[PDB]
RNA sequence: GUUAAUUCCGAUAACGAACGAGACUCUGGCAUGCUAACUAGUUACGCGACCCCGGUCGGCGUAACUUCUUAGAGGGACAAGUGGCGUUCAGCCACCCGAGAUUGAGCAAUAACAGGUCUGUGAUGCCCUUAGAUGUCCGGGGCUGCACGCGCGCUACACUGACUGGCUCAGCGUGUGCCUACCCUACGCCGGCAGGCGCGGGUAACCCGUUGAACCCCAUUCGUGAUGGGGAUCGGGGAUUGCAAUUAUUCCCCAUGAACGAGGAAUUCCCAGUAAGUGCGGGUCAUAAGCUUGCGUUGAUUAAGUCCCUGCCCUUUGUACACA
């Protein structure tokens, strides 16, 4: 049926399973320290998180 | 746009600021992207004091 | 009776070597083994340099134990080289007269500044856009 | 805590908490004069002060 | 163009020449012996080790890259 | 007397290899003569009794520091992994060869398994190591 | 020993392939196809051979023993993982094949791929990279 | 030996520098001779601090070249030591004196440059640098693709340069540069 | 009796003020106190591209986040530790009180 | 180049104009004097101002300053 | 005139100013002094083990202390002292004392490009489509295709090297997840290896881990031969990840053993712990480093200058250019 083909592909791995938590896109994801967000929004919200370019 | 930037700048100079910089970018008086810039007062740009001496929006 | 313990560190780029002088006989050992077996053996006379410059009479009354960590081979060798000399200078400053300390300091300085003064040169940070600190990647026109 | 998260992930999660908080209140309190937030995380109580201009609004 | 056809083992004349002239050389090292006698370097090293076993040459400083031998003492 | 640290180690491991040649009861495995000692090595060793020499090296490493299991043995016997067209990296050694070395040194009492994991060295092995240290000292004197 | 002995073979002849007697035995066997450095050292170790000797000093009954050990790996205690025809398709026997049957079984494997008409056999017939290589930038010196 | 210094087994004294032009720029006598040609560094900080570096250390530093050998100073200390052994066992003199004579003979007194090329006489420090480069380049060219080792080649090049028999590559390039500068002046 | 306060903070001088205030509180309440033991700090390093797209010169950011962890051992019952940690806390410092 | 800027030089001239009696020849004395009398936020700027104070005091002991 | 600098001195129809540079922040080093420490240790003791009173132990436990450990407040260096040059001003060079007498990065002004990004966005105007969809889901393929050319890189062309054993030293770091299904691994057996099977430790100065990393050092084998250099291509087999590896995902074993003998015109990057050699972490990662970003080891040649080329910044000059 349609219920057995709509969301039956395995999403246990890969970059298509995870996404950004702002853009929900699947490119340039920062998975380090559980950020799980793209580098553009990381540059956007690094001041709000606490990251700062000291050196 | 001009009167609104004049009003915002006059209000913040009435409140009391060391200096300001109002940049309105976009399409004005036509299709070509014209960017207006209103600067007066003491305003610093470079160095570590830009982190905690100015407020940027 | 009184313990004449002198603990003096010596630093290269990363290697830190702490020498320890006491009252005793003329034996010098580094990490539980003497100076005659510290590889590479090409820098054996470099290890023997304070003994060869000062004679066995100065080192006869001092026993030196050195604990070493960090760096590479030449770094640890030059670290213990600096550290045993600085430890002997500090021991002769603390427990005997300052004139012999000044003469031994003159003998060490007239040979090499590295025996007493550490080198402040350390590794420069690598920058983005290059395989090293100063070098860049190969720029390709056209 | 039973999940036992590390401090490396915990301060990052608090930063993303403050970021999503600031963005949500920027989108929602925009017409009312939003100016910021300040969150004091105490044990068993979470004080979270909206800093804004028009308190009646 | 050029090819070095060195001897893998001793000829009789080359062995007599190594017994005659090589303990009279000031440089007794296997590369120089191989260059002068057109033999292998390993063959030269085994030859100098057996000359050490016989007792006609004097060791100066041996090493994993190069061993150094010279003549016997003069007096 | 003397310890093994006053002794030059390069001839000391060969002297303990000669001591294991003199003893001859380590119960060597059957696959000694044909195996390659690591995944990063390319050939078999030139020496026919590499097992005794590496057991000597294992004895002096466990004398210097104990609690070294099979992972630490592969760490001390790792090396360059020449990947050919790719750049080289560090590669750990073979596990089973040092495992058989530790089983031989547990068979004849030179090492003993210690609590909280690892192999330490027994006082009988310390006695044998200091006796052969005195032997190499008397040889170099 | 150090001089040239009697009956010194400058070139040995084993399995229609010349062997340089100047070269050391564990490397002089490597001129034969199907045997390399590792399997040569395994054969010389499983036989009672001083491997310091050259390939001209050793005797003819002993090189016949070397030939029998190289032709029969299983019967002289060599494991199955030193072999280049582990679990063959046609007969299923762990064996070491030397310098003519190697090319024969290679062209028979190419003929089997040609018969089954696989993509692997098609890339072999075309003369291209079959293990999945990128032929866009490399492989130009072979084709003109 | 606390008073007099021994370069390995070699004496500091009895090293006569023939050229008085190369007296200060050859740092070999009574202050700069050490136990090993290895050292810590700092000689490349100031301009004329390179002249105070000892000449055996300068040969040790200039020997390590061509990619695969950059940063093997213990290894080229071994090379220079065995080369001094071969120099003593061939010539029968002081290897330090042979090296000083090799620098004096191999150093070109003039060169030519663009001010058409005009010839000018070079600085003595530049002459020492050119000699150290040329004899090292000749030794490496003799050692590349050869049975003769690098210590034997460096010993033969230093002995041929101290002799001046025109069989050394350094002496040949010195004569070539001197002849070109004699021509275009 | 042996109660362990762990102080984790991003700012430096605020954490120093908090640990000094805990030292002054222990000195006023008269208990055996250990010194403020510093841990080696952690530098969370992120290196991304400056450009949102990929077309530009190869420029790279260095986003740093330094976190610091001090610890203070107290020889006192639980109510004293709760009374000390209840008073004068500021948002930069996270406090973890271990009983054992 | 170790060239002093105007924020060093004018502030040092104001310090010497207001506190000529307190300042002296020794760098480590009049550096602490300038630290006491002037609110300087950073040690490097403080050292620059104190060094230019010492140099102008040498100029004053040599002769008149414009 | 001076400076890395529109940096200052000084002249002066200019005066008073402002951004930038500088100043600032972080990093690197020096403080046998202050604060600290059972998630770092030190040295003394008490035992234990071994060798002939003494030596070793990262074997155990405790007695003061912080030299080594880490991180906080401070301090220290400023052309300050001397000798010269210089309007005796701005400043420049050398030297003594000394850990430094130019450590490195971040930030970075006005004005602009019709430079890149609508394929980062639930930033977006307009246009197109909107159910037989350019929306969304599933299966397979492709993004890897190969007569050709270019660019960034890796491997090398060997004897200053390769192979085989022995010795011996690091620092950045990271590590069990909101969805999320995927962590670092000690140790004991099975197997040659890739790996597999069980007990543990670790949310991290606790465990991996004293991070037993390479280059290098020592000792054999090789002998100038496209050779034991080099490992491309290709056959046979064995394992892990995943629902699924065929167009070989990767890894391991045997075998096959190509060009390449230091590279033409042309051209890149760099001057001190620098280039280069060399290995280790993060990102992409279920499986995964020839890339990139950081770190550590060994560690130099030559230069302290110039506008010759390529360009840049001031002043004057000329212009028939001003999308210059
Ligand atoms: Mg500014
Ligand atoms: Mg700035
Ligand atoms: Mg190793
Ligand atoms: Mg050669
Ligand atoms: Mg455009
Ligand atoms: Mg699909
Ligand atoms: Mg592509
Ligand atoms: Mg091409
Ligand atoms: Mg090879
Ligand atoms: Mg080959
Ligand atoms: Mg990439
Ligand atoms: Mg005109």
UniProtKB/Swiss-Prot annotation, chain B:
Organism whose genome encodes this protein: Oryctolagus cuniculus (Rabbit)
Stated family: Belongs to the universal ribosomal protein uS3 family.
Entry-annotated residues carrying N6-succinyllysine: 18
The protein's role, per its UniProt record: Component of the small ribosomal subunit. The ribosome is a large ribonucleoprotein complex responsible for the synthesis of proteins in the cell. Has endonuclease activity and plays a role in repair of damaged DNA. Cleaves phosphodiester bonds of DNAs containing altered bases with broad specificity and cleaves supercoiled DNA more efficiently than relaxed DNA. Displays high binding affinity for 7,8-dihydro-8-oxoguanine (8-oxoG), a common DNA lesion caused by reactive oxygen species (ROS). Has also been shown to bind with similar affinity to intact and damaged DNA.
Record's protein name: Small ribosomal subunit protein uS3
Record's comment on post-translational modification: Methylation by PRMT1 is required for import into the nucleolus and for ribosome assembly. Sumoylation by SUMO1 enhances protein stability through increased resistance to proteolysis.
Subcellular location(s) per record: Cytoplasm; Nucleus; Nucleus, Nucleolus; Mitochondrion inner membrane
From Swiss-Prot, chain C:
Record-linked InterPro entries: Ribosomal_Su5_D2-typ_SF, Ribosomal_uS9, Ribosomal_uS9_CS, Ribsml_uS5_D2-typ_fold_subgr
Alphabetized PROSITE patterns for the sequence: RIBOSOMAL_S9 (PS00360)
Residues found modified as N6-acetyllysine: 56
Cellular compartments annotated: Cytoplasm; Nucleus, Nucleolus
GO cellular component, one term: nucleolus
Main location: cytoplasm
GO molecular function, one term: structural constituent of ribosome
UniProt keyword Cytoplasm present: yes
GO BP: maturation of SSU-rRNA from tricistronic rRNA transcript (SSU-rRNA, 5.8S rRNA, LSU-rRNA); translation
Family under the similarity heading: Belongs to the universal ribosomal protein uS9 family.
Protein name: Small ribosomal subunit protein uS9
Source species of the chain: Oryctolagus cuniculus (Rabbit)
Lineage: Eukaryota, Metazoa, Chordata, Craniata, Vertebrata
UniProtKB/Swiss-Prot annotation, chain D:
PTM annotation: Methylation by PRMT1 is required for import into the nucleolus and for ribosome assembly.
Secretion signal span: none
In-chain residues carrying the UniProt-annotated modification Phosphoserine: 6, 35
Subcellular localization, as worded in the UniProt entry: Cytoplasm; Nucleus; Nucleus, Nucleolus; Mitochondrion inner membrane
Modified residues (Phosphothreonine): 42
Similarity section: Belongs to the universal ribosomal protein uS3 family.
Described purpose of this protein according to its UniProt entry: Component of the small ribosomal subunit. The ribosome is a large ribonucleoprotein complex responsible for the synthesis of proteins in the cell. Has endonuclease activity and plays a role in repair of damaged DNA. Cleaves phosphodiester bonds of DNAs containing altered bases with broad specificity and cleaves supercoiled DNA more efficiently than relaxed DNA. Displays high binding affinity for 7,8-dihydro-8-oxoguanine (8-oxoG), a common DNA lesion caused by reactive oxygen species (ROS). Has also been shown to bind with similar affinity to intact and damaged DNA.
Name of the protein described by the UniProt record: Small ribosomal subunit protein uS3
Range covered out of full length: 1 to 57 of 243
Swiss-Prot record, chain G:
Positions where N6-acetyllysine occurs in the chain: 93, 105
Compartment(s): Cytoplasm
Residue list for modification N-acetylserine: 1
Record-linked InterPro entries: Rbsml_uS13_C (IPR027437), Ribosomal_uS13 (IPR001892), Ribosomal_uS13-like_H2TH (IPR010979), Ribosomal_uS13_CS (IPR018269)
GO CC, any one term: cytosolic ribosome
Molecular function as annotated in GO: rRNA binding; structural constituent of ribosome
Predominant location category: cytoplasm
Swiss-Prot/TrEMBL keywords: Acetylation, Cytoplasm, Isopeptide bond, Ribonucleoprotein, Ribosomal protein, RNA-binding, rRNA-binding, Ubl conjugation
The keyword Ribosomal protein belongs to this UniProt entry's keyword annotation: yes
Cross-link Glycyl lysine isopeptide (Lys-Gly) (interchain with G-Cter in SUMO2), where in sequence: 90, 93, 105
Any one GO biological process: translation
Physiological role: Component of the small ribosomal subunit. The ribosome is a large ribonucleoprotein complex responsible for the synthesis of proteins in the cell.
Self-association state and partner proteins as the record states: Component of the small ribosomal subunit.
Family: Belongs to the universal ribosomal protein uS13 family.
Protein name: Small ribosomal subunit protein uS13
Source organism: Oryctolagus cuniculus (Rabbit)
Lineage per the UniProt record: Eukaryota, Metazoa, Chordata, Craniata, Vertebrata
